[PDB]
Amino acid sequence: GAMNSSNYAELFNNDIKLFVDDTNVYRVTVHKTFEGNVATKAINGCIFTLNPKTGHLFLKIIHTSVWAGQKRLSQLAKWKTAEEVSALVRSLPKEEQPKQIIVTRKAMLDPLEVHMLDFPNIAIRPTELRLPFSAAMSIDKLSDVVMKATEPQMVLFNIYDDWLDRISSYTAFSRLTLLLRALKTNEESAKMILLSDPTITIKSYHLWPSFTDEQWITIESQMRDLILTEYGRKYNV
């Protein structure tokens, strides 16, 4: 059925699974026209397809050309997402194919189920988790490859850098969701926390800074403080 707090460890078992988040597939700026109407301008988007056990991120860049002369783009974006996830599964060797695909938004269930009819043994599931994957585009290297794209492109990342050398996938996922939730809640404050200290850098081959274990504890506490601080600011609490 649906993935929730009851079945959290299931994310880190040895059954291959992918999260799919479609919140950055169709991205627009809204502006006034010369006649004072309103128009949208699409910008490049992405599908966020993540293996939470291994950190492998299949970032499918959605170039604005795919919207050209199309109607009902918010509807089409879900079907394009499902088409591309289906194409990714078919591209993978059998032993690498997921046994489950967890969609972050319930509106992705029918499109993905219909595109995956040829895979009746791959379960398509919603989640009751509120996951902050919309903030993927706050990770500078991911934003940069999406915006620079001139055509449809798939780029492969490990969203955990080398953390799994030191920590479990449960802990790595917890750290990722904390970082993304902080970036979602107050992007400028989170990037200051991560990038403030110039003596700690990001390796060419990494997304996040090269924190030692003790520095990660400090950063994680600063991220929790940020989220609390912002919840207090929001609710005047």
Added chain:
Amino acid sequence: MNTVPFTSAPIEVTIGIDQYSFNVKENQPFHGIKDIPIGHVHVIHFQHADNSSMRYGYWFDCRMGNFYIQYDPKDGLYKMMEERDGAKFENIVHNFKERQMMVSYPKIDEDDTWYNLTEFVQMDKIRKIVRKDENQFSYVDSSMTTVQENELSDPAHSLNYTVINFKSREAIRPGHEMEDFLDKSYYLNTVMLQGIFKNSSNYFGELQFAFLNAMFFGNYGSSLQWHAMIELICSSATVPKHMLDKLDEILYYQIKTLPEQYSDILLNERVWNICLYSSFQKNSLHNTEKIMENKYPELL
């Protein structure tokens, strides 16, 4: 006008004949139904007074043979049987008619209700949905499952309705996923009409048969099939105009006949709201929309 004689009525029973129904008392001198209109299928149905579980009955056409009902005290139900001896059968019917031991099919001359509910229903198509080739009549009851329900278990006692499944490879052409899922025209016109039913009359016949089994037996699978066949047309952008106009007639008479107090169990809110107010055909079913809004405004 043909006749279905009864040997006797040893148990108290409500007897249906088409949209009519009569209560018979235990050992009442009841010997059947006369003046049955030739040219239509008919259904003769039963609900026992002492056990309202299993509604059951028989679809028949008096053009195909001489049928009678006999109670079986072993299996505990009224059974239809065929009499092959025409002269015996005529002699029994004459005796019961002269003794006025039969009720008369109570058709009002003005009243096209039964024709309107069975316009496309043929015995030969019933006998392919309900498989018992040794009889010319077809038994249906409240509990019989459909081939589709059995997939999701005695296959011989099943209703072989055509399987309709909007999230099936049959319904969705590889490469046309969004197209075929949001617009069911492919599935309706190529797969179902051209492919399986061959024409709109067969499709409407099965839809009308599903509705009647749902209404007369409370057969849940039949209700599912009726709504699936409505939704398949309503969810298709491209439907021949004659089919839309005919569907509106079909559904109008079905909604007109439905017992008001069964609307909560016989009508699917999601399907009807989708079909009347959201679908491609939301503006194609004027008569059905008007009767639904006047009779069942709470469902909508």
